[PDB]
Structure 1
């Protein structure tokens, strides 16, 4: 559910606030889709599902995980490599917008306005560096990736 996305948003903030090189996340389809989007934007370094212990750092991306069956599904966990540049984290803030108490949806007409620094609906304009992620029929895209594809949908989080 959306509660997993809120717990994920806050965890990645606490992990970057603690300057951790690695971080773990529950293995869920929803979490993976947002993680891939963050990776496609350059905010995180790696994505890999494994056990309760992190894989070998030297061969992280080469680590071949075992099949995820019902015998070990409860132990699986997604391991994302955090990014830090110039004495600052690349994933400082991950303020969510859609919460369990209310799922905020945006239209294509609103995303076009928000992508250029103008409020629309329950959202606010994007500034330099900020990034917005929308869950659409074509996967969890970026607000600017959803504008070229001409689709709207659920607004997940806002990255600064």
Structure 2
């Protein structure tokens, strides 16, 4: 998958959160789906739906080779006390510099230790980790002891 795409998704979500947009669209790919699903499960998003370029789908539309170019993920942005719940979405691994951490170092990051210039996890922040072609929480990666590329630090 493409971290460049992920970088564009992370910047797009930050821009939409700053302008207080309720609903926005991101490219339909497996990476963006797993990324948005983790944000939804962690309560950063209000909704995650399939759609076209025009809007979220009302009824279930099958994804075919003919329609794949028009398909988007529609994501509901969450706001609480006139503030965005997704305030910052920054890449840790860049396209030019990928950061793979062992489980022990991911555990040290969760325990308040700085590793390879990655600041320790703070309360209410999320770090997404890529292990075995899946995206999950940094804590989830440690729980499965799955060493893999790091990804985004949501706050």
1:103 aligned to 98, 101, 120, which one?
98
Number of equivalences: 154
Q: 1:10 — aligned with what?
A: 11
Structure 1 gaps, min length 5: 57-62
RMSD: 1.4
Given the two structures, how large is their TM-score scaled by the length of structure 1?
Answer: 0.91
Equivalent runs, 1:42-121 vs 2, <5 Å: 42-55=43-56, 63-121=58-116
Shift of 1:138: 6.9
- Please give the secondary structure, in 1, of the residue aligned with 2:112: coil
Shift of 1:65: 2.9
Shift of 1:45: 1.2
Q: Deviations for 1:56-113, whole angstroms, at most 9, x for unmatched residues?
A: 7xxxxxx333111111111111100110011111100001111111111111011000
Partners of 1:122 and 1:136 in 2: CA distance: 21
Q: 1:142 — aligned with what?
A: 137
Q: Which runs of structure 1 show a deviation greater than 6 angstroms over 4 or more consecutive aligned residues?
A: none
More strand by share: 2
Structure 2 gaps, min length 5: none
Q: 1:59 — aligned with what?
A: none
Q: Could you tell me whether the CA contact under 8 Å between 1:110 and 1:121 is conserved in 2?
A: no
